[PDB]
Amino acid sequence: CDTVSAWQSLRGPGTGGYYLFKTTEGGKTDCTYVKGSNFNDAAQTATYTYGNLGSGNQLTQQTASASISGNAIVVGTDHSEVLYSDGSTCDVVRLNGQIELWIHSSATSNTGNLNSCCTDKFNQEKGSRPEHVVYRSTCPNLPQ
């Protein structure tokens, strides 16, 4: 289960975006997501649009520059260390001690059949910490 690089994780397929599927973090807002655009492969920088479910059944949106530092995806002060990513469908990252399993928008109808490398890494790294499911099928589509 050789991981792709942090840049390959950030960029993913280069289209769509990622929903937070499971996390060790409690109190997370439903439909937490990130979506990259304006990918600069040379500089390994992108625009991130991110948010979660707000009012009126609409996703919130805030933008930030996303970049890479070592093996972490950097958004503001958040450095999310890439534990495993396939660069295509899912990522397992560590941020503020929390273990997070993110899924590409193309993978949201198969959450029981995700890349074994992603689920194995998430299950290993969370240890005895209870998981929380943040994604649901009724989450709105990502910002277009």
Ligand SMILES: NCCc1c[nH]cn1
């Ligand atoms: N595809 C990477 C998703 C992500 C998680 N955290 C920051 N970005």
